[PDB]
Amino acid sequence: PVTLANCEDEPIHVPGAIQPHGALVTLRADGMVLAASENIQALLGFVASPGSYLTQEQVGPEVLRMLEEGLTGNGPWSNSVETRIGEHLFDVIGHSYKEVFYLEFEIRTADTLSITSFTLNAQRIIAQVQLHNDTASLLSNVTDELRRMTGYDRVMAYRFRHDDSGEVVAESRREDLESYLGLRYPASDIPAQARRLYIQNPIRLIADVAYTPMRVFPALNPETNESFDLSYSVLRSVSPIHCEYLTNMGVRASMSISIVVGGKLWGLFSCHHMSPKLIPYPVRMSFQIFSQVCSAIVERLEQGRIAELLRVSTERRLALARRARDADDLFGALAHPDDGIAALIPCDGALVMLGGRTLSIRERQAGNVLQRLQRDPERDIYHTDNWGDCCGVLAIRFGWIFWFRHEEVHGPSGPRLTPRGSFEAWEEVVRGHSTPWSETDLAIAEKLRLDLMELCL
Amino acid sequence: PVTLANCEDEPIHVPGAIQPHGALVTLRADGMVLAASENIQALLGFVASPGSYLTQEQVGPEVLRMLEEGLTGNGPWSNSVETRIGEHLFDVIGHSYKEVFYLEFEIRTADTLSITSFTLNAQRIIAQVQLHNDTASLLSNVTDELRRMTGYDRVMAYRFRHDDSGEVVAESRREDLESYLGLRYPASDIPAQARRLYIQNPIRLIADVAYTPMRVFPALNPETNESFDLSYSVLRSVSPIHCEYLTNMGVRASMSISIVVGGKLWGLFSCHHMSPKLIPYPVRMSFQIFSQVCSAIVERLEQGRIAELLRVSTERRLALARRARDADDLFGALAHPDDGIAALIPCDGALVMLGGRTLSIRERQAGNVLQRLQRDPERDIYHTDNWGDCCGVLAIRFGWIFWFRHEEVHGPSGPRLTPRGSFEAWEEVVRGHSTPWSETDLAIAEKLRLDLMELCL
């Protein structure tokens, strides 16, 4: 059973059930059926029974042909074919994962996307990704054009911050609907397995959120004694918790393009529609490759950006050391506040103590902080938050130096599963926390302390 | 008739013919046949005749359905369909240009490419473009991964200097064949029309070089009284001049992927084959989009690179001005080989002159040159090639400054058309010529002279 105590650790990769707008058949390395969704009979003619091998008179030759390329091919298998199976026309989408071949049969609604039509869906959106250098403009434009293409009632862009939280930084919507721009949610809203998954699969599609699921039996794969890993499964079922959530939001369909940098989920477009919605495989695949393209683009953009700040920041420090290694009045040289310490690390106020002289840029607290480093009389550095009249504190020793950051930063069945009810849960994590001290800030204060450890007279 | 005098003016966009590995039908905006290749009957079993309208019984319903969505469309029409006609299965590629509908029939000789397989070609190759942050690692890698994909037996990469000349900066070949790296050709080797084109069309495919062409009739479009524009036409016809060339090279097939920065041809991968070869539409359409991605990835890398040189460069001047303006010894500040003016513009030698005192860093050519501008006694700036013993000369007045570049830089049926033969007619135009003075170099000397216009004492 699934609750708020239990959402942190839920195995959404091996649910043992899909969604009903398709069917699933799992087969082993020799094509023998190991398991099938329970609507196979309802969607198609056959009764896929463990032990059986698929036959032309069940699934068509196109599928068998396809599946064969798979069983004899060597590496990971991915492929599809547009086959008529008796009731309807189908997109049969296969892959192998672990030591299992999945054959997901999703429903087609005509007609064939020309290869060409497919190439300019891709090229149309990609094109929107390469007009801009700013990362914000980039997100803002794609968010827009995605909606034009999909028709989704709402297209959104989320950024993820080092602390694994989330912000909505772009939007294009139906105006009947509330705006989300600026909203903030915690890491806890996307459990490690959702996340680790959004990285693995560029795209997710949820078609009906109040869909009532469809199980695969057996729930457990005889060959391996473990359940089936539907990680790469298209129709893989959605967790119930996130379903209670989207319903509290009044949303019936979902769709997510991923944006990945380093080995990490850096952001993601999440499309919403207020009635059920299905984006056909071929078109998903467009946006699949878009996701590959967008991710690289952002990586280089963001490394260039960061490298810059990193340089102006280091170029500052060095400027300051050369200005002191060559300057007397180390206090006054540290001090034309504009050349000052507070100009090196992002803070709200800072402090330069040495000898019996102080200056509170942007004195008394200094005899209290040195009095809390009384029990660690050999610390040359100090870093904390959540604390006088400031919670963010970073301290270096050579005389000392301090930088400060305050913190004025900024139905259902369960409580917190709501847009504003997640933002409220957020505030708590942040009401006693200043902007944390980047890897960089620890390096700067560090290189600085050393730099001033060179000065002799 | 086409000669070496007639190479640069040849209209290769309006040949009135195509390659024979397919057939072409043109139609006015209402479907009526305006012209067709002289090989339709042979290939297809129709006699597409001006005045006719195509009918299901010759072209299949699939085409007509396509064509109709074109006629009743609004914008630039592009699309295609994999129909079977009487003898063969076909890739039928259509587009509208000017006010005409081209229907090109290219013989299909494979199994269908799954939308999935297609996407992995796209993604495989794209992944290559995104591994590297260096522009040369980039070319080198993709240049390789392309051959693995296509199987072409020689695939090269070309960069294009500002004078629109060429240079093979990467390669991957069948060992039996001579290597090409470092090779250089003139602008003349690619006339502004072929270049205009490669910019318009990501991809060109030459199927057989000694192909003996197939004409379209009438040669001239009655509606317009002009010839048909076959840019954007896939089966368009190759110039004979370039055909003689590839043959003098012992090359039978071709294919090129464009790389475009600014509105300009920045480089392009060219694929060669010592025997006939033919990439299918759909695959070409993977590389089409690849080309789009690759072009962008390159544009941003190069603007970053250049944005950087341009900064280290400017930061230099500024450094230099503050050193001169803030010391009394200018000669000593302006000629310190490290604070050197020689450090500002990329040269082989330089010179500082003011009063009766000079210094030849890295002097006689100067006596002649200050004698040249004797007939122009109100110039404050000078620049030239191809000229004593140094040909590159740039001079600024304040008191004078000079920068120098010597230029030690570095069968058939027609005279020149050959690899080592275009390089021979490349040299004779560059020998007198020193590395030309960049747009950037004229801005640096100018800024400098102005900066020094500043010093009062």
Ligand SMILES: */C=C/C1=C(C)C(=O)N/C1=C\C1=NC(=C\c2[nH]c(/C=C3/NC(=O)C(C=C)=C3C)c(C)c2CCC(=O)O)/C(CCC(=O)O)=C1C
């Ligand atoms: C403890 C488990 C979960 C909590 C708590 C929760 O809120 N969701 C939990 C499970 C899953 N969430 C999944 C995706 C997801 N969750 C969010 C969180 C939000 N916080 C907000 O304030 C808002 C909106 C105002 C949201 C949506 C987001 C943004 C996402 C990504 C997809 C989306 O944006 O719709 C998730 C993955 C499900 C799947 O698709 O398989 C699970 C499970």
Ligand SMILES: */C=C/C1=C(C)C(=O)N/C1=C\C1=NC(=C\c2[nH]c(/C=C3/NC(=O)C(C=C)=C3C)c(C)c2CCC(=O)O)/C(CCC(=O)O)=C1C
């Ligand atoms: C003045 C007209 C031409 C001269 C001179 C000539 O050499 N070719 C002329 C016509 C065309 N050339 C086209 C493409 C093209 N030409 C070159 C020139 C080279 N210089 C070299 O050193 C080498 C090889 C070592 C070559 C090939 C190149 C590189 C290219 C691009 C295509 C390729 O690399 O194979 C051209 C376009 C024809 C078309 O495809 O429509 C025309 C016309």
